[PDB]
Structure 1
Amino acid sequence: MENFQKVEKIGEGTYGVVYKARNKLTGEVVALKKIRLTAIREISLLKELNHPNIVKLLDVIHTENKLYLVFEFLHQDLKKFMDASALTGIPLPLIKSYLFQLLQGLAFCHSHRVLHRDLKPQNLLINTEGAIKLADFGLARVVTLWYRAPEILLGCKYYSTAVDIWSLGCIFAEMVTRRALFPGDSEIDQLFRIFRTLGTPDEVVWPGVTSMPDYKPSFPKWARQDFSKVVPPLDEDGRSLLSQMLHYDPNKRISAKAALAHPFFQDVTKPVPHLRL
C-alpha cells in the first residue's frame, strides 16, 4: 500500500471500504478496495474474467495480514446517471443498449459459473463511450433489498444464476418508469410488495414454493395485477421480455443467453450518453 495514494472515498461495501487511488508504480488511476479482516483462492480465481462488460480485477495484494482488491476505475454509476435523468428520463435506445450489454456480461460470467448475487444501480458503471459494466462481481462468500430474488427472501440457500436475471429485470423497469419497482423496507415488506404486483405464488406457478424454508401458509393471497400498469411506457416486446425475467420459478426464468435473442433487441444500437463528471 506504499504503492497507492488515496484521492477520495468512493463508498463503503458489504466486505470492505472503496477508494479512488493512484498507483505510484504506473501513474494509473484505480478503484482500491480494502477487505475487513479459501478466500485468496477464489479471489485469485476472479482475475480471469475478461469481458467488455465487466470491470477488470487488475491485482490482488495480500500484505500485513490484510487483503486489497485493485479494480479498473470508472467515473460514474447508473444510480447517479438515473438521478440526473429523472426530469426527462433515459431515452429508450440507451435503456436497450445498456440492457443488451449487461446481458452479454451476465451470459459470460454465468457460462464460467460466476454469479454476481447483489446487482443494483449503484454497482453498474458507465463511460463516455456508451458502455456499461458489472462491478463488485463474484465476491459474495442499511442493505438494500429492492433487487433481491423471491427464492432468496424465502430462505433458499442453493440458488442459481437466475437470481441475477431477477435483479436485472428490476433495474430494467426502474430505468423505464423512473421509480423503483419493489421498494421494500424489510424482508417481509419486500416479499409482500412482490406478492401484491405479481400475485401470491402457489404450487401451480411455482412447483415446490410451499416447501421453501421461510414460506408460511398464513401469507395473504393477493391476485396478480395486469402488466400494462406496471411499466406503462414499455411496448409489448419489452413487456414480454420483462415478464420472463420476473418468473417466480427460477427454472422457468429466462437465461441471459436466451434473453439476448429476444425480439426486443432487433433494433438495438449503441448510443452515447451525455455525462457530467
Structure 2
Amino acid sequence: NFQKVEKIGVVYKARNKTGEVVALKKIRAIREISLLKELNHPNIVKLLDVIHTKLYLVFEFLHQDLKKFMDASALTGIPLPLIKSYLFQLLQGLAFCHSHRVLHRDLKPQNLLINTEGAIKLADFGLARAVVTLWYRAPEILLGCKYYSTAVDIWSLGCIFAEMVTRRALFPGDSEIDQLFRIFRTLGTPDEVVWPGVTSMPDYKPSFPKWARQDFSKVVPPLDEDGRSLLSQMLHYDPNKRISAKAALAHPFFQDVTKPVPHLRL
C-alpha cells in the first residue's frame, strides 16, 4: 500500500499508492490510540491511521526537526524571535495535550518537527507504556517516581529552551546518575526545603553529594530576565511548583511574540 521513500521502532517516509507523502511507523490499546486521530491541534503532528496486523502508525510528514535545525544554526544561533515563537507554539501544543490528559514523556529536539511556514509540532509521543537520551528527563523520573505528571513535559521543554538559546545541551548526561548529578551541580542538590518529599523518592539516596545552586545568569547567559524567569519556573525541582503550559503562555516573555519564518535547507 505504501511506496517507501527513505528510512527517516523504525520510521519511514512513504508514499500512499492517494499520492500522499506520510511518516510510517512500524512498531513490532488499539482502542485508546485510535481516539487520538480526531484530537488535533496545529502544534501536534497529525495521526492519520492506526493499523494492527505488527502495529503501524501513519502520521503527517514534515521535512525537518529542531535538532537538525539547531545544528544547521549553530554558527549563528537561532534568532531570539524564532526561539520565542517555537517555545510559544510548543507550549500551546502541550497545553492542548495536557488538557486532554495526554503526556508526551519523551520530548527532545529530534521529536519537534518544523515546516517552512514557521510552525513547530510535537511528535514521537512516548505513549507505549501508557542509546537512550536522558538529557531532557525530569528529575522525578530519574529518582524513580512511579507516576508522571504533566510537569515532566515542562521540564523537558525548559531544557530545550535553554539549548536553543545557548547552542549547547543543558544537562548532557550519559547514565541516570550522571544525568541526575549534572542537574544537581547546576541547580543545587534538592532538599526538603525546595522539594518536599524528595528524600522519600524511590531512588533517592541520603549519600547523594550536596552541591550548591549556581545562578541562571551563568546558565543561559545571553537571555534577558523575562526569559530567565520563565526558564527558572520551568525547571523548578518540585513538580507541583513547576509552571504549567497554560500559565507559561501568559508569562511576560511572550508579550512581544511573533511568528517569523525560518530559513530551511531541504
SS in 2 for 1:243: helix
Q: Does the 8 Å CA contact 1:114/1:138 hold for their aligned counterparts?
A: no
**Per-residue CA distance 1:52-99 (angstroms, 9 max, x = gap):** 000000011122xx2110000000000000000000100000000000
SS in 1 for 2:110: helix
- Whole-angstrom CA distance in 2 between matches of 1:92 and 1:41: 42
Question: TM-score if structure 1 supplies the norm length?
Answer: 0.95
Deviation for aligned residue 1:138: 5.3
Deviation for aligned residue 1:140: 3.2
Question: TM-score if structure 2 supplies the norm length?
Answer: 0.98
How large is the Cα RMSD of the aligned pairs? Answer: 0.7
Q: Does the 8 Å CA contact 1:196/1:223 hold for their aligned counterparts?
A: yes
Distance 1:33 1:120, change over 3 A: same
SS in 2 for 1:188: helix
- Whole-angstrom CA distance in 2 between matches of 1:204 and 1:238: 25
- Whole-angstrom CA distance in 1 between matches of 2:12 and 2:39: 22
**Per-residue CA distance 1:75-128 (angstroms, 9 max, x = gap):** 000000000000010000000000000000000000000000000000000000
- Whole-angstrom CA distance in 1 between matches of 2:264 and 2:210: 45
- Whole-angstrom CA distance in 1 between matches of 2:27 and 2:146: 24
SS in 2 for 1:45: helix
- Whole-angstrom CA distance in 1 between matches of 2:98 and 2:215: 31
Q: Does the 8 Å CA contact 1:46/1:138 hold for their aligned counterparts?
A: no
**Per-residue CA distance 1:8-27 (angstroms, 9 max, x = gap):** 100xxxxx210000001x00
- Whole-angstrom CA distance in 2 between matches of 1:200 and 1:267: 35
Confirm or deny that 1:30 pairs with 2:19.
Answer: no
**Per-residue CA distance 1:16-49 (angstroms, 9 max, x = gap):** 210000001x00000000012xx21221122132
**Per-residue CA distance 1:122-151 (angstroms, 9 max, x = gap):** 000000000000001252310000000000
Distance 1:183 1:195, change over 3 A: same
Q: Does the 8 Å CA contact 1:78/1:123 hold for their aligned counterparts?
A: yes
**Per-residue CA distance 1:181-219 (angstroms, 9 max, x = gap):** 000010000000000000000000000000000000000
- The answer for unaligned runs of 5 or more in structure 2 is none
- Whole-angstrom CA distance in 1 between matches of 2:122 and 2:191: 33
Single out whichever of 45-54 and 244-253 deviates more from structure 2: 45-54
- Whole-angstrom CA distance in 1 between matches of 2:68 and 2:105: 21
SS in 1 for 2:32: helix
Q: Does the 8 Å CA contact 2:106/2:126 hold for their aligned counterparts?
A: no
Distance 1:170 1:258, change over 3 A: same
Q: Which residue of 1 aligns with 2:49?
A: 59
Distance 1:190 1:138, change over 3 A: closer
Deviation for aligned residue 1:240: 0.2
SS in 1 for 2:57: strand
User: Aligned ranges for residues 200-239 of structure 1 at < 5 Å?
Assistant: 200-239=189-228
Q: Does the 8 Å CA contact 1:155/1:213 hold for their aligned counterparts?
A: yes
SS in 2 for 1:109: helix
- The answer for unaligned runs of 5 or more in structure 1 is 11-15
Identity of aligned residues (%): 100
Q: Which residue of 1 aligns with 2:253?
A: 264
Q: Does the 8 Å CA contact 1:117/1:140 hold for their aligned counterparts?
A: no
Q: Does the 8 Å CA contact 2:40/2:46 hold for their aligned counterparts?
A: yes
- Whole-angstrom CA distance in 1 between matches of 2:27 and 2:35: 17
Q: Does the 8 Å CA contact 1:209/1:215 hold for their aligned counterparts?
A: yes
SS in 2 for 1:204: coil
Single out whichever of 217-226 and 136-145 deviates more from structure 2: 136-145
